[PDB]
Short mmCIF file of C-alpha atoms and ligand atoms in Angstrom, two decimals:
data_model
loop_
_atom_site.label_atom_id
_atom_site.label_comp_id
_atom_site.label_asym_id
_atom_site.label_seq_id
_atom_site.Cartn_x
_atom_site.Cartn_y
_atom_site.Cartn_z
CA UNK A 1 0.00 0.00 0.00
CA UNK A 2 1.28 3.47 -1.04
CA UNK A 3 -0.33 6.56 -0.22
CA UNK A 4 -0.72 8.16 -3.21
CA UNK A 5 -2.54 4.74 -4.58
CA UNK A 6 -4.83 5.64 -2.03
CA UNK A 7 -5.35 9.03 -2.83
CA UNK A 8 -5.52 8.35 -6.60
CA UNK A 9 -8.09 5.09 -5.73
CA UNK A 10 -10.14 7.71 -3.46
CA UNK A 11 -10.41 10.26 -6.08
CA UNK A 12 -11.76 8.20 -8.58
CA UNK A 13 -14.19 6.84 -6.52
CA UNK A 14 -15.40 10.07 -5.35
CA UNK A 15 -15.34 11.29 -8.89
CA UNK A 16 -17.24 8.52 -10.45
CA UNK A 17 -19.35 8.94 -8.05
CA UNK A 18 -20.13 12.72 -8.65
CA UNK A 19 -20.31 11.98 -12.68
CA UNK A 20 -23.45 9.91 -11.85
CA UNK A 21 -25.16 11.93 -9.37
CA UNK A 22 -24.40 15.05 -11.78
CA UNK A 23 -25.15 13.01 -15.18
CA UNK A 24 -27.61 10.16 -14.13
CA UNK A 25 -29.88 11.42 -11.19
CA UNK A 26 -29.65 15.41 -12.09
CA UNK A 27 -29.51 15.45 -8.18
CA UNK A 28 -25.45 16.49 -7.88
CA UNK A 29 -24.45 16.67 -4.04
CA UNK A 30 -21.69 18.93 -5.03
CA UNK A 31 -21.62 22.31 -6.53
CA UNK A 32 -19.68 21.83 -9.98
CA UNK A 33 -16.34 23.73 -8.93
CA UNK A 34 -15.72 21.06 -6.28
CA UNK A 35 -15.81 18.48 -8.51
CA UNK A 36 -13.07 20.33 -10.72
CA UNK A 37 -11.26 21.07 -7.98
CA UNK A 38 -10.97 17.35 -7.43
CA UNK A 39 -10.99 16.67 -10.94
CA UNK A 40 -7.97 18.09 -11.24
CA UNK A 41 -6.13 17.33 -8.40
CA UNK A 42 -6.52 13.54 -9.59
CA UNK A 43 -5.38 14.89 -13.06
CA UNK A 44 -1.81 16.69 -11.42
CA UNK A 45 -1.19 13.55 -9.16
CA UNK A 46 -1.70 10.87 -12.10
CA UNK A 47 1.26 13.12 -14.33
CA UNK A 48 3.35 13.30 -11.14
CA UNK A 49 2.42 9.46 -10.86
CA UNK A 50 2.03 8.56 -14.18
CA UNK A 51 2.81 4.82 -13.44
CA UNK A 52 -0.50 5.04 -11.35
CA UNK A 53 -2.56 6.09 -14.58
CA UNK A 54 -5.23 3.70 -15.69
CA UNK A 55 -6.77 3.63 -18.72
CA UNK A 56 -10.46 4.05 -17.12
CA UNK A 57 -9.84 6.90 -14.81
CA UNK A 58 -12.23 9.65 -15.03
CA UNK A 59 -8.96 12.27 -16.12
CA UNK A 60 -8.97 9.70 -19.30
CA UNK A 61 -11.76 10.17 -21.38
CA UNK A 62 -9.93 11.98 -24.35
CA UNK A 63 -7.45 10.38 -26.45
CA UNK A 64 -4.19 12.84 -27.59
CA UNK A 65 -3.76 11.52 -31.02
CA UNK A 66 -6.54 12.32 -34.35
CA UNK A 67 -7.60 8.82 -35.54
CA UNK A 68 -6.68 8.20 -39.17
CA UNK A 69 -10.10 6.43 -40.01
CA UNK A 70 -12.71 3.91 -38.18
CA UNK A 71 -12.41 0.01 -38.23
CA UNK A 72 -15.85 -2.22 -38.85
CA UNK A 73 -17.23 -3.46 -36.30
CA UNK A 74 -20.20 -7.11 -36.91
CA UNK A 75 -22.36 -6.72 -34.29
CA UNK A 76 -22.88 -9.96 -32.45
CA UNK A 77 -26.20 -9.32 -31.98
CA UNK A 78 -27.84 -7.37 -34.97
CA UNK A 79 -29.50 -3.91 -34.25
CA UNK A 80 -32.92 -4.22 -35.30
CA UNK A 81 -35.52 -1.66 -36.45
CA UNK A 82 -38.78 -0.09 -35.28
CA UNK A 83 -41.96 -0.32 -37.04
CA UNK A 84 -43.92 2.74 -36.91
CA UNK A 85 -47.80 4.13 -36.75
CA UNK A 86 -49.11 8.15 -37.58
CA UNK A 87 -52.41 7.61 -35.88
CA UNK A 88 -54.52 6.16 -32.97
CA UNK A 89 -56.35 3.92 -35.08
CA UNK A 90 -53.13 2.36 -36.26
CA UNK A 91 -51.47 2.40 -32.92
CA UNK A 92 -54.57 0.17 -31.86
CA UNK A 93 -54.98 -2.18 -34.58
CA UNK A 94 -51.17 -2.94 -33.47
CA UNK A 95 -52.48 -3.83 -30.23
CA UNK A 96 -55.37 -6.00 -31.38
CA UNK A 97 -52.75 -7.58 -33.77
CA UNK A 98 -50.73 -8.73 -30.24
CA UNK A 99 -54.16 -9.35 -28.58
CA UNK A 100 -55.03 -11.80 -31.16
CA UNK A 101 -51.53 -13.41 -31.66
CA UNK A 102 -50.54 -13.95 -27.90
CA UNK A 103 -51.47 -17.56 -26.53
CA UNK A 104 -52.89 -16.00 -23.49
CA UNK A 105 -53.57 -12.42 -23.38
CA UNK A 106 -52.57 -10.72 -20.29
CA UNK A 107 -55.24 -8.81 -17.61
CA UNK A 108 -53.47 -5.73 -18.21
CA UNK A 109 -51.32 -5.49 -20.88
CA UNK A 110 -48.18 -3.36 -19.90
CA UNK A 111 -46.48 -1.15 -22.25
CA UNK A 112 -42.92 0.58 -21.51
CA UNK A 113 -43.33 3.74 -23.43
CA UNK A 114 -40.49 5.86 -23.83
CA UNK A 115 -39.61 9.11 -26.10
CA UNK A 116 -38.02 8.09 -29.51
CA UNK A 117 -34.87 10.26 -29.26
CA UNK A 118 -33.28 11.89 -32.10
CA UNK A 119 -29.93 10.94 -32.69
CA UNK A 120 -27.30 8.05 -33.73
CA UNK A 121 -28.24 4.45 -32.08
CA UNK A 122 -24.94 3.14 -30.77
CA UNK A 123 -24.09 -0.27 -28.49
CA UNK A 124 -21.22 0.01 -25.68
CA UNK A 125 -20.28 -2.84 -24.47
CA UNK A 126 -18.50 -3.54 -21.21
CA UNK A 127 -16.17 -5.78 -20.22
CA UNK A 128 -16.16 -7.08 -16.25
CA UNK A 129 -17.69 -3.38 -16.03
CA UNK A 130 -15.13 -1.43 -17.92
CA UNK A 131 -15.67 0.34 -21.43
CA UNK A 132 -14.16 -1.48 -24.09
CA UNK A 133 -15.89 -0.88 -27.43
CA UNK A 134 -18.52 1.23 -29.16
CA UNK A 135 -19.83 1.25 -32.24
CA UNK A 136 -22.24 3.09 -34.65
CA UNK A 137 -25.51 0.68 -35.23
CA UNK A 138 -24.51 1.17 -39.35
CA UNK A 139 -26.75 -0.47 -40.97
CA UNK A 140 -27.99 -2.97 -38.05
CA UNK A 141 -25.30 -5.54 -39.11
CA UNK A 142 -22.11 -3.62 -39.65
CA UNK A 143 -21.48 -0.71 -37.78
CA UNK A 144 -17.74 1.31 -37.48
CA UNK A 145 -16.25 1.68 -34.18
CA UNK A 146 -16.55 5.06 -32.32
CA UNK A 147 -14.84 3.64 -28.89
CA UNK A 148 -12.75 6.97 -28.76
CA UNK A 149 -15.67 8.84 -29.57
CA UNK A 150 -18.43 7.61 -27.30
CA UNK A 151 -15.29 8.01 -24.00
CA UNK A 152 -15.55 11.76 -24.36
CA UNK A 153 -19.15 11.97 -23.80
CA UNK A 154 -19.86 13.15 -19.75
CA UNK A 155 -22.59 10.99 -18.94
CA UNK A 156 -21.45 7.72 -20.56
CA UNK A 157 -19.28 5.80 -17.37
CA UNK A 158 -16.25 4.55 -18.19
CA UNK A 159 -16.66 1.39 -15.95
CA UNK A 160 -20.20 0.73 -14.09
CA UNK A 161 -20.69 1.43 -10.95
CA UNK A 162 -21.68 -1.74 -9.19
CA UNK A 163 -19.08 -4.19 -7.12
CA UNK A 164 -20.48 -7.03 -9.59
CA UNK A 165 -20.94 -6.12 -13.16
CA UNK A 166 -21.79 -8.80 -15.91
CA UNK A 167 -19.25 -10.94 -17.22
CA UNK A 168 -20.34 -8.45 -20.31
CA UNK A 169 -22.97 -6.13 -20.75
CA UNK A 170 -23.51 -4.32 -23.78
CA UNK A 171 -25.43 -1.33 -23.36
CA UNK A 172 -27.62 0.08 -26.22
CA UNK A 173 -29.00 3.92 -26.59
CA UNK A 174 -29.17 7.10 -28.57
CA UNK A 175 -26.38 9.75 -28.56
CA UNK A 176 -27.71 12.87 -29.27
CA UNK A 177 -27.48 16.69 -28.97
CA UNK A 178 -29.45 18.91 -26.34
CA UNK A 179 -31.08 22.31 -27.87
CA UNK A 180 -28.57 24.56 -26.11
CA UNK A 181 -25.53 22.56 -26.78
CA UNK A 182 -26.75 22.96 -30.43
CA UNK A 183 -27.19 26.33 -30.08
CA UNK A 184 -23.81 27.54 -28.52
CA UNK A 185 -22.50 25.11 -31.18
CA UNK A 186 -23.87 26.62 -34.46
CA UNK A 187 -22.97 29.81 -32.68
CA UNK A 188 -19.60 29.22 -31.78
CA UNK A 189 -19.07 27.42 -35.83
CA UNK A 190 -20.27 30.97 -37.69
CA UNK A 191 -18.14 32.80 -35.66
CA UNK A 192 -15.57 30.44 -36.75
CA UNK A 193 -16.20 29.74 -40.36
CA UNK A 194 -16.83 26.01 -39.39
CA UNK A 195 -19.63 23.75 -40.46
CA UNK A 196 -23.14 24.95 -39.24
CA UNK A 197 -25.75 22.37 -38.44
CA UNK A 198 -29.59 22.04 -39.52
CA UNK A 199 -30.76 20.18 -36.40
CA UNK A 200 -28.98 18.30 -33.29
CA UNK A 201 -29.82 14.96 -35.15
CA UNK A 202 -26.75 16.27 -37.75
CA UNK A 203 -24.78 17.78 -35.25
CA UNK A 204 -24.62 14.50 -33.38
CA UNK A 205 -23.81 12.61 -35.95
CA UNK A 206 -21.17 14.15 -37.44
CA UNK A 207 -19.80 14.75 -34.03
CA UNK A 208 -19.76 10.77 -33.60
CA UNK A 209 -17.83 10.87 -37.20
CA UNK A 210 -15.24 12.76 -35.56
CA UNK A 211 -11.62 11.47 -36.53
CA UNK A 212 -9.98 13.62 -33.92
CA UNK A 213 -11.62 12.70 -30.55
CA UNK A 214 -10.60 16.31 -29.07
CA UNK A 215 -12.98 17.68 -31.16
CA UNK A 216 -15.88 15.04 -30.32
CA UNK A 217 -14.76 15.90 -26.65
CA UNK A 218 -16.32 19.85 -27.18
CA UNK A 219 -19.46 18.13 -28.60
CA UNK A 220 -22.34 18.45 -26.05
CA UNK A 221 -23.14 15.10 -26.87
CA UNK A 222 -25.45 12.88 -24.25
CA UNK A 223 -26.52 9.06 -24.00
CA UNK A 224 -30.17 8.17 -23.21
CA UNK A 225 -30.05 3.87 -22.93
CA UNK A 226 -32.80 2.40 -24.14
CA UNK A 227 -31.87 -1.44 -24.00
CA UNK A 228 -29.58 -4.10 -23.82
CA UNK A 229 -27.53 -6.19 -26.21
CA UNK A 230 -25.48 -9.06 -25.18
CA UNK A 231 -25.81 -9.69 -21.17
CA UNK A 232 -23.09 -12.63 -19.99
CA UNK A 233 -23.09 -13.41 -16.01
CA UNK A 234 -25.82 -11.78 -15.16
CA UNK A 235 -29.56 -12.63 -14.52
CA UNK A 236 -31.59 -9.78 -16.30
CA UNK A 237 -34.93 -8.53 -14.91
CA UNK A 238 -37.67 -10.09 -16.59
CA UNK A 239 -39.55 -6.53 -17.96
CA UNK A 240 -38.08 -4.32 -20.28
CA UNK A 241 -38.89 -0.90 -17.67
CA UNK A 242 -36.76 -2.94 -14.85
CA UNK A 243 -33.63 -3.81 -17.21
CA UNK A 244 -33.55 0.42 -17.41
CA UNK A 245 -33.89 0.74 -14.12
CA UNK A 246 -30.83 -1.55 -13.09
CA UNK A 247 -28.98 -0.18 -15.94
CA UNK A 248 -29.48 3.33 -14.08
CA UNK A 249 -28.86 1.86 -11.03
CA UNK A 250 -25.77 0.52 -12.26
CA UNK A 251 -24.29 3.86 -13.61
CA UNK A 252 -25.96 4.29 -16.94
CA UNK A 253 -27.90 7.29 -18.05
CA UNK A 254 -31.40 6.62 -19.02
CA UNK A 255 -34.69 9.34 -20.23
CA UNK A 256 -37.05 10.13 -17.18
CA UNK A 257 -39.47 10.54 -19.07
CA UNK A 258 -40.30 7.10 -19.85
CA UNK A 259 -43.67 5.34 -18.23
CA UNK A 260 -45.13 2.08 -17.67
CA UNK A 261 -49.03 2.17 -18.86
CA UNK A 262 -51.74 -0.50 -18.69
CA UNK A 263 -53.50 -0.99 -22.12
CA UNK A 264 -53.86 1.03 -25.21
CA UNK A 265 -55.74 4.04 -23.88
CA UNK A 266 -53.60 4.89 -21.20
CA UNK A 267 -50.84 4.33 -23.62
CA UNK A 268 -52.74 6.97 -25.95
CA UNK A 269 -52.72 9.35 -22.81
CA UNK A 270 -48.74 8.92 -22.62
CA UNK A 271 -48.40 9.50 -26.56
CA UNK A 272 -50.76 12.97 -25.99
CA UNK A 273 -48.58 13.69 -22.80
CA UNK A 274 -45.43 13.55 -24.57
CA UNK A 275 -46.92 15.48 -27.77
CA UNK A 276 -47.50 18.78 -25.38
CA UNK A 277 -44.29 18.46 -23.48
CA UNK A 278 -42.50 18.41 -26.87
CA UNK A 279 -42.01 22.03 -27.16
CA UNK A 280 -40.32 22.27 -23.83
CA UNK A 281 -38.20 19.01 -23.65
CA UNK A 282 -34.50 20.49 -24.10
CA UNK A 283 -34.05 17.88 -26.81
CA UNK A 284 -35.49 16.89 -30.34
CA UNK A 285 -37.49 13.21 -30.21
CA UNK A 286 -39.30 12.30 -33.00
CA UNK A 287 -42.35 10.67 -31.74
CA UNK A 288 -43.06 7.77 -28.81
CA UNK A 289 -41.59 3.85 -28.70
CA UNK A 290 -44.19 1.79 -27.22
CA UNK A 291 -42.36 -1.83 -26.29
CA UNK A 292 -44.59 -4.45 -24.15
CA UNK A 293 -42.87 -4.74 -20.99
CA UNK A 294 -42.89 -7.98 -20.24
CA UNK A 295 -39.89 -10.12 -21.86
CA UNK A 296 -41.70 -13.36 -22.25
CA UNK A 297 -44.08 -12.07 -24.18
CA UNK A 298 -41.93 -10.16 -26.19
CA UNK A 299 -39.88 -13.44 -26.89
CA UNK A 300 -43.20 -15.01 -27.64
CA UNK A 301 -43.88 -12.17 -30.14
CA UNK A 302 -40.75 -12.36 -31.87
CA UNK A 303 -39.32 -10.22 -35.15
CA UNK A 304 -40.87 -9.83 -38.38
CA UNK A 305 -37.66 -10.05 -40.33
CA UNK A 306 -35.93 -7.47 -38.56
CA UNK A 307 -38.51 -5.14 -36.13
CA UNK A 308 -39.76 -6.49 -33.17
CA UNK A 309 -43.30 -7.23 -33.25
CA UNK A 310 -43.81 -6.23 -29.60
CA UNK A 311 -42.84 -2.47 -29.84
CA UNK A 312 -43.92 0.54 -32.57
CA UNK A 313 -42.39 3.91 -33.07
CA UNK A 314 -46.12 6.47 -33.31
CA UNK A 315 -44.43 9.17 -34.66
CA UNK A 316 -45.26 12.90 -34.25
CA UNK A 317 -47.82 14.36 -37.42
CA UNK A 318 -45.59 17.57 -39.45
C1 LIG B 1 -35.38 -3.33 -31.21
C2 LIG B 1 -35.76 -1.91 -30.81
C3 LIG B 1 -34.71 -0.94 -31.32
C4 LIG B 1 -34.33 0.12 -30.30
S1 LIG B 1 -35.63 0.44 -29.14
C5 LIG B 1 -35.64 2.11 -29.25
N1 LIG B 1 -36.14 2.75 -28.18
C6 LIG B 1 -36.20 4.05 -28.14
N2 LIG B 1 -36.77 4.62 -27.02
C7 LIG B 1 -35.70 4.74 -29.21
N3 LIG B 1 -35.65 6.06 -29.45
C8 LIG B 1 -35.05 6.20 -30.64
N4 LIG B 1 -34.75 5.00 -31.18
C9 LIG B 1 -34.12 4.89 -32.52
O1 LIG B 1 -35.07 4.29 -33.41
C10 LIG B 1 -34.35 3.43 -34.34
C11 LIG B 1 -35.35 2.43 -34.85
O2 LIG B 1 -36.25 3.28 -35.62
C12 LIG B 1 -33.30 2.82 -33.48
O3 LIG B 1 -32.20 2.38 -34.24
C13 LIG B 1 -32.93 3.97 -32.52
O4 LIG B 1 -31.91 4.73 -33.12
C14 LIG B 1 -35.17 4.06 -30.32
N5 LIG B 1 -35.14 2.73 -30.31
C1 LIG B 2 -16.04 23.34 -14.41
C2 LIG B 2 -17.18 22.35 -14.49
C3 LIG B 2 -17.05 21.11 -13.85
C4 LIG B 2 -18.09 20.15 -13.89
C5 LIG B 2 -19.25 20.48 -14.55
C6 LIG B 2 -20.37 19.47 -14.63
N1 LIG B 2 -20.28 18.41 -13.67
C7 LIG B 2 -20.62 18.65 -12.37
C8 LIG B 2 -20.51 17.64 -11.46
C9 LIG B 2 -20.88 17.89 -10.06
N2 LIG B 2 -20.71 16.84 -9.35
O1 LIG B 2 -21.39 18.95 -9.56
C10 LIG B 2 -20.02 16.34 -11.85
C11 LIG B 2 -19.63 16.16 -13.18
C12 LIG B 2 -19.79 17.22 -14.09
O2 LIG B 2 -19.45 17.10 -15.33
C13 LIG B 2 -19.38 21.72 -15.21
C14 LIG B 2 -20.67 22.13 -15.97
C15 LIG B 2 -18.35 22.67 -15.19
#
């Protein structure tokens, strides 16, 4: 035992901590110059230390060096796609389309209904809790790998923060662009002859496309998780609003916006709900995901070639 292990092993638990009461609850318990002030005490002592560094510390999101290009990554599970409805009618005839098809049909049926964010779909997986890969979804097969990327984002951990993680967990979400980020950003890119953006759904992407992670790093990019790829040594809950829970409760950033709501009418009520709010969300989403919550039947469900048949994107009319 040395002290400044100590130290350095202190300060990165205190830190990690911070990032996910600041990121992941929105309920920080310090104001945000004490958690520079530690920030960068860790940073000093880890270059006065460097044999101390580790490759996950909080001081380590940003990599020094421009990448030359991005490597393909074969998902090992594929990234599927959403179907989608534009009305009520055809959000219910997708529910009597379940009613019929299940075996037995459920006293309530339980949706998880959550915003459809407006960004790039990504999957970060984790190894024994520690960030080792990201990639783009591409084209739900093939994606490119945006590890260096997706470690400069502030509310994406580095490792989880649990005592047990999964064997391997691979987390999967939306990366996208808050209004006032992408304000200050198309601001700050006239008055710097750079590349202005139409909409954050641009701006995030081409952040993510970012060779040169220091540049990704000024991005005010932001992960909302939405589910769950591969899951080794680990028993998952058995509804899909649970898995998001644990996920948060593990360190991962999920939307609070998202519901659980008993049959197609209240669902309906959620989809109106989120339809008002839209003006005043600090973020672009594109409509509602409605995903039945319960995991068997969604297994019993299944995919039609490659959408689940147990969720539906109801978009937003123009
Ligand atoms: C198998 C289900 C696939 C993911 S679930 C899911 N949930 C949400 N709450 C989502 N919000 C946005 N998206 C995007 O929509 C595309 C499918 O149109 C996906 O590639 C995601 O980029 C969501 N996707
Ligand atoms: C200088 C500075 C430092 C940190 C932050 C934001 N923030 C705050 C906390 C915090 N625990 O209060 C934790 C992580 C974090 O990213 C800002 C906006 C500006």
């Amino acid at each position: 035992m040395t002290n400044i292990q100590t130290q350095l092993d202190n300060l990165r638990k205190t830190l990690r901590q911070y990032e996910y009461e600041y990121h992941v609850l929105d309920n920080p318990s310090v104001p945000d110059s004490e958690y520079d002030r530690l920030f960068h005490q860790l940073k000093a002592l880890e270059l006065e230390h460097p044999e101390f560094l580790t490759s996950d510390s909080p001081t380590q999101r940003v990599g020094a060096k421009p990448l030359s290009g991005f490597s393909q990554i074969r998902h090992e599970i594929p990234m599927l796609s959403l179907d989608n409805a534009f009305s009520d009618a055809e959000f219910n005839a997708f529910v009597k389309r379940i009613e019929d098809r299940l075996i037995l049909l459920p006293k309530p049926l339980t949706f998880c209904c959550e915003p459809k964010l407006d960004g790039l779909a990504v999957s970060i997986l984790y190894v024994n809790g520690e960030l080792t890969q990201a990639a783009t979804r591409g084209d739900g097969t093939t994606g490119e790998d945006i590890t260096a990327n997706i470690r400069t984002i502030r509310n994406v951990p580095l490792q989880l923060l649990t005592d047990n993680p999964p064997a391997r967990l691979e987390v999967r979400g939306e990366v996208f662009m808050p209004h006032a980020g992408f304000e200050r950003l198309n601001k700050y890119a006239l008055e710097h002859n750079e590349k202005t953006f139409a909409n954050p759904r641009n701006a995030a992407a081409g952040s993510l496309r970012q060779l040169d992670p220091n540049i990704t790093s000024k991005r005010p990019l932001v992960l909302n998780a939405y589910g769950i790829g591969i899951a080794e040594g680990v028993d998952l809950p058995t509804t899909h609003y649970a898995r998001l829970q644990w996920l948060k409760s593990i360190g991962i950033p999920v939307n609070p916006e998202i519901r659980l709501c008993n049959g197609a009418d209240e669902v309906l009520g959620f989809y109106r709900d989120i339809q008002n709010k839209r003006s005043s969300l600090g973020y672009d989403i594109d409509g509602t995901v409605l995903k039945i919550n319960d995991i068997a039947l969604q297994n019993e469900l299944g995919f039609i070639s490659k959408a689940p048949r147990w969720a539906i994107a109801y978009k937003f009319p123009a």
